[PDB]
Amino acid sequence: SGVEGAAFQSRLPHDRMTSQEAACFPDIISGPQQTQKVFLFIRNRTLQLWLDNPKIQLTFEATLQQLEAPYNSDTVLVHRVHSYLERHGLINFGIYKRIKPLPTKKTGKVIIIGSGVSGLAAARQLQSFGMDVTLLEARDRVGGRVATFRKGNYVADLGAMVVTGLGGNPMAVVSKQVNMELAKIKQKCPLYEANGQAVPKEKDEMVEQEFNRLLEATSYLSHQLDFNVLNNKPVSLGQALEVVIQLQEKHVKDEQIEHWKKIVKTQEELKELLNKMVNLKEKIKELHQQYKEASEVKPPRDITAEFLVKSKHRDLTALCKEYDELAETQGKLEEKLQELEANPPSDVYLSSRDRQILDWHFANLEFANATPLSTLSLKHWDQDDDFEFTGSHLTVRNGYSCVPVALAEGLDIKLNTAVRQVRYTASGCEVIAVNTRSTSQTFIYKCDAVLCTLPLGVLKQQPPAVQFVPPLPEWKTSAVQRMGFGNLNKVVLCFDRVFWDPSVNLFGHVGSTTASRGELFLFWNLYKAPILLALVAGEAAGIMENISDDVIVGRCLAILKGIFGSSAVPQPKETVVSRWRADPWARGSYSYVAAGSSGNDYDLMAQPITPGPSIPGAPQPIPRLFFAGEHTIRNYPATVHGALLSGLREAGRIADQFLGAMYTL
Amino acid sequence: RKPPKGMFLSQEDVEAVSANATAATTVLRQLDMELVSVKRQIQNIKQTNSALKEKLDGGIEPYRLPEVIQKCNARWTTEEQLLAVQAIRKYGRDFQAISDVIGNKSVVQVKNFFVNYRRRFNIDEVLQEWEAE
Ligand SMILES: Cc1nnc(NC(=O)c2cccc([C@H]3C[C@@H]3NC3CCC3)c2)s1
């Protein structure tokens, strides 16, 4: 709370200056700690001001007026700070009524490839800055991977659905700016097996904790044992889950061995002691005979004959003392063996039923990373997990489509315009686009710089859907093959009667086999309308795209039928099934840190490209090709907010190169 | 520093299950068989020990003798002295046995007795005879 709340809400340390700011304000950071604290307050304040009302522009004067002394003494510093915030989209970003209207004459021409959230964010920002922006769209609609199905009152995102927490999330700002029906997620998810019978609390809780214990395990393997390379190859996350389940399965067997080996160690102490008891009884048996024979000689007897009866009597009671000591000991071993037979260790690490339910927890992981766990980097798959926003993840009730559509208000957006060639030279760029409907109609666009928000899957496409002239340097193309672009699809089931538990937003289905763990393994009730939404994660994703809507819808009813009874499952009125890998404007769903990749590859993706000099011997030129999109932001990948932040980011960096950065003096 | 609890991730075990593609199911069934072996072995001794139990049926109740409760005396009758020399001859120095045999004199008297009746009963000569066996 306070000014400091605004720094946290802007992803920024309230009491330290970022590497960003050191760049623009090296006088301050290298200077006395007092000025830093001033600066920091001025920043933190200004952020606040924007945040408390993000529907109107925050002009520099407005800022100064509300700022108080002694902080409002150095107008240059305040002006310096406010421009910096404005340039890099920390303030006056999104959709705001501007006080001072746009300068009528623009400076510079920038072509943006793709009207996705990264694209529009940059576009809005650049226009905002007085630049001539034009976005080229292959699709007939904006939002790219923010897709929303609409028919009558039916509404369901084929694309993003979830706003991950408003603590420090730029979407928090956007939602105040565009009315967004933000409904929370009730985390409670009941799991239903193949039979259609719910898994009992005992079981659900006991397998979920194993699952987390298993992750915590892979992390331990990765960091403390450095199990990251195996057979000259990077270790996948899935690889190491096998190796951890196997090692826990080995321990189960180990402890059964050690426990029965402790029965044999005691049964054999018994068998050896039984032997002594049986040999002593025979010895006793014959002693008795000797004593009775000696006792048979009736008195009066001479002393050697008296000594013999006494000697035999003494000896025999001596042996009867041994055999009594040795049967107290037999009682102890008999009970000790009895304990061991009753405290047998766990029969199995996990049952077939148990491990089928475990799979559904791996399907969740596969759906979060939109990829088989065998492709995730062990070391790095969760590298973005420190920057999680606080707060509970929400869903958009009126569809996520409204954000994108709201960002396009007032932008030159050419739809049905497929870029096919990007040509960039020392003197400027030209992009070649066709009209998607009749591929022959051809367009040429000239510009000072191109911002590329082509999805990573499009960029991966061989043979190239878009060729770059000159080709991208290998350092870029390599980071593109290295990185992973994965898949998850959705099935939208539209029904007239809500026939599920309306107080649970989401509920699972446990797949029959491991290889089919993600086939429709999770269902969502998010909407005021009666729509259940079925996810296809992991391997299932790529496979179900080769199968019909009907066949896919069938398996949907079936599962629904099983969990609710053939009776209450009406025929779905409208069916939509996404096929994102098939889509050529995406060729995937979102990025994931592939094994052998790292978070540095995202950094690579975002470094822009500077072409060679036209005339040899001419001075090193300006960079002309920039990259945005969810695959460029290393700390917030595969998310709508990450995309958006990357658009804001490039816009400021493009503005700094072509409008000049006056806030550095 | 250390794994979650119950997880048993030795540094040395991972290599063993990572050494080859089928190495995992190797070690895992190498123990599946070894467990069977012990189980087999448990049945056996359980039988062998069960057989021995049967033999010990009746315990030793029939071969037991009632205990004599005779008040220890301190006078040595000519008889008791004679019981003694024999007990030494067959026990040598087991003080308790000799006291048990006479069953009226005690270990102190018995122990004293060797030095009292010493040249008289040639105990040293006797004791050598006991040590011969
Ligand atoms: C309760 C819960 N808390 N968080 C939940 N969901 C997610 O974190 C989530 C779900 C789907 C996709 C992603 C993608 C951003 C993630 N890229 C990978 C996976 C983390 C690094 C995250 S479940």
Residue A77: inside a domain: yes
The reply to whether A387 falls in a domain is: no
B126 and B92 within one domain = yes
Tell whether A258 and A338 lie within a shared domain. yes
Q: Of A548, A495, A538, A549, nearest to A515 (Cα)?
A: A538
**What is the amino acid identity at position A468?**
F
Strand A417-425 with A522-525, pairing: unpaired
Residues of the domain holding A295: 248-342
Instruction: Check whether residue B84 and residue B124 sit in a common domain.
Output: yes
Question: What stretches of A539-646 adopt beta strand conformation (E)?
Answer: 574-577, 591-592, 625-627
For chain A, how far is it from start to end, CA to CA, in angstroms? 32
Separation between Cα atoms, residue A377 and residue A591, nearest integer Å:
12
A89-102 burial, b if ≥16 CB within 10 A, otherwise e? bbbbbbbbeeeeee
Other residues' Cβ atoms within 10 Å of the Cβ of residue A168: 19
Helix (H, G, I), strand (E, B) or coil at A310: helix
CA dihedral of residues A401, A406, A408, A410 (deg, nearest 10): 160
Examine residue A487 and state whether it is found in any structural domain, yes or no. Answer: no
Number of domains in chain B: 2
A297, two tokens:
């000689």
8 Å CB contact between A84 and A661? no
After which residues does chain B show a gap where C to N exceeds 2.5 Å? none
Q: Tokens at residue A465, please?
A: 């859907």
CB A80 within 8 A of CB A43: no
If you take atom 22 of ligand 1, which residue's CA is the nearest one? A368
Does residue A22 form part of some domain?
yes
Identify whether A420 is part of a domain: yes
Backbone angles phi, psi at A449, to 5 degrees: -155, 150
A582 inside domain: no
Would you say residue B26 lies in a domain?
yes
B71 inside domain: no
Is residue A23 within 8 Å of residue A15, measured between CB atoms?
no
Confirm or reject: Cβ of A639 under 6 Å from ligand 1.
yes
d(CA B26, CA B34): 12
| A420 backbone dihedrals φ, ψ, rounded to 5° | -120, -25
Of A314, A313, A294, A293, nearest to A305 by C-alpha is A294
Taking each helix axis as running N to C, give the angle between helix B107-116 and helix B78-91, from 0 to 180 degrees, rounded to the nearest 10: 90
The resolution in angstroms reads 2.9
How many residues are recorded in chain A? Answer: 665
CB A627 within 8 A of CB A654: no
Q: Vertex A488, ends A482 and A492: CA angle to 5°? A: 160
Find tokens 């967004």 and name the residue. A180
What count of Cα atoms within 13 Å lies in the side-chain half-sphere of residue A34?
2
Q: Inter-axis angle of helices B95-102 and A303-342, to 10 degrees? A: 120
Task: Determine what percent of chain A falls in helix, strand and coil, rounding each to the nearest 5.
Answer: 45, 15, 40
A630 lines ligand 1 (CB under 6 A): no
Mutate to test the interface with B, among A216, A243, A250, A251 (most CBs of B within 10 A): A250
> What distance in Å separates the CA atoms of residue B121 and residue B133, rounded to the nearest whole number?
20
The residue from A326, A342, A358 where one domain ends is A342
Tell me the chain A residues in contact with residue B24 when contact means C-beta distances shorter than 8 Å: 242-243, 246
Determine how β-strand A625-627 pairs with β-strand A449-452.
parallel
Q: Measured in angstroms, how far is the CA atom of residue A530 from the centroid of ligand 1? A: 26
Residues B128 and B85 in one domain: yes
- The Cβ of residue A431 has, within 10 Å, a number of other Cβ atoms equal to 24
Question: How many residues in total does chain B contain?
Answer: 133
Same domain? A56 vs A139: no
Distance CA A639, CA A458 (A): 17
Locate tokens 């923010």: which residue? A146
What is the CATH classification number for the domain harbouring B127?
1.20.58.1880
Q: Do the domain assignments include residue A8? A: yes
Domain that holds residue B18: 11-55
Q: With helix as H, strand as E and coil as C, how does A395-427 read?
A: EECCCCCHHHHHHCCCCCEECCEEEEEEEEECC
Task: Please list the residues that pair with A263 across neighbouring strands.
Answer: none
Name A324's bridge partners. none
Do A295 and A287 form a contact (C-beta atoms < 8 A)? no
Q: Give bridge partners of residue A507 from the DSSP assignment.
A: A523
Would you say the CB of residue A368 lies under 6 angstroms from ligand 1?
A: yes
Cis peptide before A70 (omega within 30 of 0): yes
Query: Which of A369, A375, A639 maximizes ligand 1 atoms within 8 Å of its Cβ, making it the mutation to test the pocket?
Result: A369
Centroid of ligand 1 to alpha carbon of A368 (angstroms): 5
* Closest residue by Cα to residue A632 from A131, A116, A157: A116
Cα within 13 Å of Cα(A465), Cβ side: 18
Q: Is A439 helix (H, G, I), strand (E, B) or coil?
A: coil
Are both B128 and B96 inside the same structural domain? yes
Q: Return all residues near A345 (Cβ < 8 A) that are at least 6 apart.
A: A252, A255, A256, A259
Quick one: which atom of ligand 1 is closest to the CA of A185? 1
In chain B, the largest separation of any two C-alpha atoms, in whole Å, equals 90
Stated as kind and residue range, the H or E segment containing A368 is helix A352-368
Residue B110 included in any domain:
yes
- Rg of chain A, C-alpha, whole Å: 37
* DSSP summary character for residue B70: -
- The four Cα atoms B70, B76, B81, B83 give a dihedral, to 10 degrees, of -10
Identity at A488, one-letter amino acid code:
L
Residue B5: inside a domain, yes or no?
A: no
For residue A59, the domain's CATH number is 1.10.10.10
Please identify, among A279, A311, A342, the residue that sits at the C-terminal boundary of a domain: A342
Backbone angles phi, psi at A112, to 5 degrees: -105, 125
Residues A336 and A254 grouped into a single domain: yes
Other C-beta atoms closer than 10 Å to the C-beta of A308 total 19
Interchain proximity A264–B53, CB inside 8 Å:
no
The total number of structural domains that make up chain A: 3
Number of other residues whose CB lies within 10 A of the CB of residue A427 = 14
What whole-number distance in Å separates Cα of residue A43 and Cα of residue A81? 6
Question: Per the domain annotation, does B45 fall within a domain?
Answer: yes
* Nearest residue (CA) to ligand 1, atom 8: A368
| Cα distance between residue A63 and residue A92, in whole Å | 12
